[PDB]
């Protein structure tokens, strides 16, 4: 039985070597997390994929003996509840609605870059570009006006940063978010609005509709899934580019690589801490390393699947030219990221915008001077200074 956390802490974007060791010699690894009883950890692409997408695993029926690192959401529902929720949400999250945002993303990011450029280097990628970009996008989806972007950014930070804010602070922020969303929903029930939240309020599946509680809870989910995830992923992707100079140079010389570079950076860059939420088997499931019986918990992180040499050639080397890229960074199957198209657009706009504005873009300090976050759900730099 392997104890998590593993011995030795990782710096920056490094992947703990134990996962690779387990992938080759212990593909159905018995593990003991800080809380709950023993579970299984899977690290091979096929197994991780199965764990996170096969309908024989449940996200809803977690319990006390469920392995976990800690003592409502669509992310935690199973079919058929999940299926109903997802059908309604997909009336708003459409390719047509997301794709029509392209121009507005470009102008939003260009304004943020102008301000950075006016102020002069060094700037902080995290505070000056990534965070304000992604919160603005989610505020547009929710109908939150420009003047309240800062308020949402702050409230999101509070409920997300579980080690930096107290339970009482998180309760207060959540209450504030929900009160604001309740007012937005109430306005959207009085007359149709065309923002994504107004479209969700108007969405119908025969007679079925989202309740006020489901709408409000989904607004909260959108701050964590859409803003916080995107902001951290973007900062980490920029760090990775700025520390892989040959790859960054290649992207400048060959800008048509940008879409593949974004997919490769999604595959490569770690976001969380390598465990993920347990899934519980509703029924026996044969995986590569053996059989998971009904009732047993399985942890499976996409980051480990995305380094499996069974699925990617030379997986521990960043290669932005990779054409075949079936990474699991947005998941797979029923829970597949509802915002993937928009996330991809965001990452292309930001990275493409950054490289075009700043040919001389570089870290403003050596990498050993970047301080990395230590608690909470996300890896990321505390501050990421750049110069140009
Ligand atoms: C770089 C950005 C992003 C990454 C890496 C990311 C990744 C993910 C992942 C891994 C999942 C879970 C897949 C699973 O559990 O099987 C997910 C779910 C989700 N994402 Fe994202 N996401 C990103 C951006 C966004 C954005 C911009 C939005 C909305 C505008 C969004 C909305 C969602 C929603 C609603 C779900 C839940 C879907 C469900 O449970 O059925 N995401 N995302």
From TrEMBL:
One GO MF term: heme binding
Residue numbers binding heme b: 59, 82, 86, 335, 337
Record's keyword terms, sorted: Heme, Iron, Metal-binding, Monooxygenase, Oxidoreductase
Family assignment from sequence similarity: Belongs to the cytochrome P450 family.
Name of the protein: Cytochrome P450 hydroxylase
UniProt-annotated stretches for the region Disordered: 58-72
Keyword Heme among record annotations: yes
Organism whose genome encodes this protein: Streptomyces atroolivaceus
InterPro entries noted in UniProt: Cyt_P450, Cyt_P450_B, Cyt_P450_CS, Cyt_P450_sf
